[PDB]
């Protein structure tokens, strides 16, 4: 929850722990490489809500 200028200085400062990926790929999560941002947007909904049979 920071801007792009603050995120680089936390990376260049070494505070947070982030792994760099090649800038034309989709990282390492298979759900993001499959369908993009919208498929991972649906997978969190499947984890938070739709896996529970609500009463």
């Amino acid at each position: 929850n920071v801007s792009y200028w603050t995120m680089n200085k936390m990376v260049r400062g070494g505070n947070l722990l982030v792994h760099r990926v090649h800038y034309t790929g989709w990282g390492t999560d298979s759900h993001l490489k499959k369908g993009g941002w919208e498929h991972r947007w649906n997978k969190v909904l499947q984890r938070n809500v739709l896996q529970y049979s609500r009463i």
Binding site: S53, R54, I55
Partner: protein
């Protein structure tokens, strides 16, 4: 259990009735809320032991009437229509001498 699988549609899966209680913030009240929802679901499913009027009905996908039975739709009132078509032919041949094209609205189709 036939009444129980219909009253709990997606809550029953692979022979196990699963209830996920998420109503209250603490888990102690969700166990109490889950217990009364199990007992309310069991009590309505127990109506099938009272009689056959509470047995849930079987949903059969029964077919439309076949082409053999649909062939008899032409012969519905066969002798009445064949008697009717003779005077409708006589109504047609007398009206052809008046205009060029005589529609079935001028022969048998009542509009007004």
């Amino acid at each position: 259990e036939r009444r129980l699988r219909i009253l709990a549609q997606h809550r029953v899966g692979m022979g196990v009735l699963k209830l996920d209680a998420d109503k209250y913030e603490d888990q102690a009240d969700n166990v109490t809320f889950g217990t009364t929802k199990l007992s309310e679901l069991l009590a309505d499913a127990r109506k099938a032991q009272l009689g056959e009027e509470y047995w849930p009905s079987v949903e059969l996908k029964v077919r439309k009437p076949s082409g053999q039975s649909k062939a008899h739709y032409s012969l519905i009132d066969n002798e009445r229509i064949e008697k009717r078509s003779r005077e409708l032919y006589e109504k047609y041949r007398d009206a052809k001498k008046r205009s060029l094209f005589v529609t079935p609205m001028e022969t048998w189709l009542e509009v007004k």
